[PDB]
């Protein structure tokens, strides 16, 4: 009967935007990011990268309900910097780190396989 299909963990349907951006009226220079069909794998990564930025004042994520597949990220930055810019910079830094890690892992595999 009510068992959802196996794919709501990873797949969007008609009308769902992967990301939705809403400004937070409680505090100036604060934004709220809603990521559809994602889980801790990406939220923890993004939060940890954002906490390294000296111009970011707040960075946190949560899953509103485990039975739903949705991430909410809140970013507050200092006055002369946009949390959108903070998010893009964090994503770019993560991609840059991962590419270097992949290259060094391949080099290590090649060095291991001979001598």
């Amino acid at each position: 009967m009510n068992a959802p299909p196996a794919f709501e963990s990873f797949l969007l349907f008609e009308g769902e935007k992967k990301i939705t951006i809403n400004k937070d009226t409680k505090v100036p220079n604060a934004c709220l990011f809603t990521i559809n069909k994602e889980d801790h794998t990406l939220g923890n990564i993004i939060k940890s990268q954002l906490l390294k930025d000296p111009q970011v004042l707040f960075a946190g994520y949560k899953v509103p309900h485990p039975l739903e597949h949705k991430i909410i990220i809140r970013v507050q930055t200092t006055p002369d910097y946009s949390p959108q810019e903070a998010f893009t910079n964090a994503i770019t830094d993560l991609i840059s780190e991962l590419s270097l890690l992949e290259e060094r892992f391949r080099v290590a595999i090649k060095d291991k396989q001979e001598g």
Binding site: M1, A3, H40, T41, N44, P66, L67
Partner: protein, 477 residues
């Protein structure tokens, strides 16, 4: 007593009692008296000796058995009111010896103190470490644990049969399970159980389950429903004929369309059948026809497994149909250990979200620690430790009730030799963030049972359905 022990002219079932104070001697040959065997003690020594044990150990191909043991005057049957005149010793090696002299007139000795338990209470590991209400709860819940009830179940045509995919014999066993044949037909699975408060979904009596394990066949089962039906050809019958009805020829007709039926009005096995599907097309020839066809139970969503056609007592055509459905464990389903710790499944997490050890082991079941302090089921913890020892040792642990040769310190010392913390605690890492958990969580394999009660068989909703004939009120059930 000499003649009874020699089986000469007094059958061993006859009980003899001397009440000294009232000067009466009573002999009962009556039926219905309950009795149990006991070892005879003469002076301070058992009459059971090493030659009897040698012969019983060579019991095969020696035609020497319990009847020959009885005939030798070693064991005796004693009923309830003869026990009043009996001085019993709990064990020979302990109570026959010159300890401080409590008694010296012992006349009998128990075979083993664990023989006071019944069939359902003999499967409990460490029952003397638990509270008696919990032992009673386990004795009642063991009758509802699912498994392989009989080996020839594929032949039997029974209503409401449940069978489990992968039964396992317990890693921690009682010496009396061999005589209950629990190895041959197990009723549960050994599972890695971690006692921790993880996300609050296991609070109260709930359980968190591993969804990745469930996807691998963990606690998967099959439910068989049987349907009886017949041509009813006796008396005021006309005939009630098995046939495939045409769309508007019979009087009774519904949005259920007959087209899964065969020529004889019977669905062939292997056909997927859902709600409202007609399994047996039976038409009445009525003084011009009425449909009395049978339907599936609503939402049963099964597959026809076997179809059988016979002749009954009368000699008219009679048909049995068995439908199966697989049912993968869900949130509402009921799970229980062998200690009275029962609980539904609060939520299922995949392997990525479950906490893990340094070795990558993730618990299959997580239970709240709050179930332990008030219910006082320490046998659960001792089983969990013993199973962890046994899985590493390669042996199967012995949890017979009253054996002094097993204690918690010895189990801890054995476990410490395999590279684990001696009390069973282990460092767990958070599944979501990867950080260590500040507390060290008690983990280990424990035997768990899936129960007959499932949410799919209990969920029900109503809005303007059937109305009772007399009260014009909603139906019952």
């Amino acid at each position: 007593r000499k003649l009874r022990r020699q089986m000469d002219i007094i059958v061993s079932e006859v009980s003899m009692i001397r009440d000294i104070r009232e000067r009466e001697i009573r002999i009962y040959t009556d039926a219905g008296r309950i009795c149990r065997p006991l070892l005879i003690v003469e002076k301070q020594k058992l009459l059971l000796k090493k030659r009897h044990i040698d012969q019983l150990k060579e019991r095969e191909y020696n035609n020497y058995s319990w009847q020959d043991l009885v005939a030798s005057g070693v064991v005796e049957y004693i009923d309830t009111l003869e026990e009043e005149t009996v001085m019993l010793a709990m064990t020979p090696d302990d109570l026959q010896e010159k300890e401080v002299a409590y008694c010296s007139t012992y006349t009998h000795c128990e075979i083993h103190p664990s023989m006071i338990l019944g069939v359902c209470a003999s499967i409990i590991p460490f029952p003397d470490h638990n509270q008696s209400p919990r032992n009673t709860y386990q004795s009642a819940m063991g009758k509802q644990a699912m498994g392989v009830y009989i080996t020839n179940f594929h032949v039997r045509m029974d209503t409401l049969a449940h069978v489990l995919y992968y039964p396992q014999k317990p890693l921690v066993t009682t010496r009396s399970m061999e005589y209950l044949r629990f190895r041959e037909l197990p009723a549960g699975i050994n599972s890695i159980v971690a006692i921790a408060s993880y996300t609050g979904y296991n609070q109260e009596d709930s359980v968190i389950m591993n969804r990745s394990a469930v996807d691998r066949g963990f606690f998967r089962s099959v439910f068989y429903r049987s349907y009886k039906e017949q041509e009813s050809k006796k008396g005021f019958d006309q005939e009630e004929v098995f046939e495939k009805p045409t769309r508007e020829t019979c009087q009774g007709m519904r949005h259920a369309i007959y087209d899964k039926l065969d020529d004889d009005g019977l669905i062939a096995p292997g056909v997927r059948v859902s709600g409202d599907d007609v399994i047996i097309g039976k038409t009445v020839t009525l003084p011009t026809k009425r449909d009395c066809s049978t339907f599936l139970r609503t939402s049963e969503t099964g597959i026809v497994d076997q179809v059988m056609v016979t002749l009954n007592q009368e000699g008219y055509k009679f048909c049995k149909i068995r439908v199966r459905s697989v049912r993968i464990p869900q949130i509402g389903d009921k799970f229980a250990s062998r200690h009275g710790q029962k609980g539904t499944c609060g939520i299922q997490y995949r392997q990525e979200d479950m906490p893990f050890t340094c070795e990558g082991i993730t618990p299959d079941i997580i239970i709240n620690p709050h179930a332990i302090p008030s219910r006082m089921t320490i046998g659960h913890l001792i089983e969990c430790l013993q199973g962890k020892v046994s899985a590493n040792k390669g042996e199967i642990g012995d949890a017979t009730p009253f054996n002094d040769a097993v204690n918690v310190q010895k189990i801890s010392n054995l476990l410490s030799d395999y590279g684990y913390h001696l009390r069973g605690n282990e460092v767990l890492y958070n599944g979501f963030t990867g950080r260590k958990i500040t507390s060290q969580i008690f983990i280990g394999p424990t035997y768990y049972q899936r129960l007959k009660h499932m949410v799919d068989d209990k969920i029900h909703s109503r809005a303007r359905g059937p109305i009772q004939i007399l009260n014009r009120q909603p139906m019952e059930g």
